[PDB]
């Protein structure tokens, strides 16, 4: 019963397990190869990243902040703004 | 300081009874109804009345089996005992919104 | 958004100054006698009349002073102005089911 990976706000799928690092801010991060139902926005920054340029991933459904894309590319998604459950 | 049942005010746990599983005592997660729960995790709790065998499907938590929670006066769900496991062997998960918390 | 008391529909608060006091702007809690609250969190609000003098007795939330909060228009009880801590200094607690929310 966590297989899949939601937005902790609204529901919207966004990973997988399947598709599967602490850091700090100048966060429990899960990367992930695939994504779906974000919405990235704003150009590409190099600014602290904890790995690669970063852009904003909003849940596409509730516009919750849910983590970054980078970019060969992957996503860095915030552990606690997700919800797991089975498939 | 304490948390009692929201629909008829049984004594359940305590402020001071919150474990943090794997970094956190919330945890939000979804069963397969669709169903969203921002769950507590407390080492103890009373006033509860578990009901039917544990089982292992579906739990949020790996190595653990879970049994429902029934409040034991009104018979409302505020969650799982959960067992089977180690470091710690049991512990309760509790629906944060079915708790009602306040002075002891 | 705003919130209006569901009296008389005075402006009380927006959703913009929604505040996560301890992880969540929703606490449901108990006073000594009993009653049980779902209190909303926000960092401002207007159109209230604050009663009394602040008191420590019994605070919901640690390090805070509390004062009963009237609608100034109609009267009715809509929640508690919080003072006294930090980060924030004050805040408002106002009952969920004594507003209406509804666009600006
Ligand atoms: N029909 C249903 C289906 C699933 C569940 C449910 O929550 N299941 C939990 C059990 C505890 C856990 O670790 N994971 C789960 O998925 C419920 C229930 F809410 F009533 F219990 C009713
Ligand atoms: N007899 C009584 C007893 C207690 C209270 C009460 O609300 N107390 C709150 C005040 C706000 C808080 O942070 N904690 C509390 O315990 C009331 C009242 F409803 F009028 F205000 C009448
Ligand atoms: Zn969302
Ligand atoms: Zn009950
Ligand atoms: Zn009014």
Redesign the interface.
Known sequence: ??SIF?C?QC?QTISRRDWLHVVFNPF?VWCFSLAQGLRLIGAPSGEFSWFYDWTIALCGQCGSHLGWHYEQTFFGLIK?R?????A
């Open positions: 019963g966590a939601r902790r529901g429990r606690d997700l919800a797991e459950g089975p």
